[PDB]
Amino acid sequence: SPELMADYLQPKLLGILAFFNMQLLSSSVGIEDKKMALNSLMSLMKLMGPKHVSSVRVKMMTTLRTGLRFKDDFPELCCRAWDCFVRCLDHACLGSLLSHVIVALLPLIHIQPKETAAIFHYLIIENRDAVQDFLHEIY
Q1: In this structure, how many other beta carbons lie within 10 angstroms of the beta carbon of residue 57?
Q2: Disulfide bonds, which pairs?
C-alpha cells in the first residue's frame, strides 16, 4: 500500500530526514547528490502529504533551511524544488513560519527574481484569512 509504505516512512520520521541532513552537512558528499537527496526529501514530503509531516515537517523545514544555506549551482533549481516541497506540505501554520519563512525567501529572491515572487504569491493565496496574522510582525 502507498499508505503502508508511508507507515514505514513514518517510523523513520524526522530521523530519516536528519540522517539525510547529516549527509548534506558532510563535505565528502557530492553537491549534486545533496540536491538529489533534497529531491528525495521533496518526494517524501509529497508522500506524507500535508497532514503526515505535521510538527516533524517544521523540523524538516529547519533542515531545509540548512540545505538552502549551501546552494551554489544547485540552488536556483533547488529553490523551485523547496517551493514544490512546501506545496506538497500542508500550509498548516504558514503564519507561524511568518518572517522566518520570509527570511529564507528574501535570500532566495536575490538568488532568482522569478522564483521568490512565484513562491510569495502562492504563499499569500494559501494563507488567505490566516495570511496577515503575522504580516504586521513581518513589516
Answers
A1: 22
A2: none
- List the determination method: cryo-EM
Annotated resolution, angstroms:
6.2
- The type of residue at 89 is L
Find cell 500500500 and name the residue: 1
Quote the cell numbers at residue 122: 502562492
Bin 54: left if φ > 0, else alpha if -120 < ψ < 50, else beta: left
CA distances (Å), origin 25, targets 20, 30, 89, 121, 135:
8, 11, 23, 31, 33
- Cell 506524507: give the residue: 48
Owner of C-alpha cell 498548516: 92
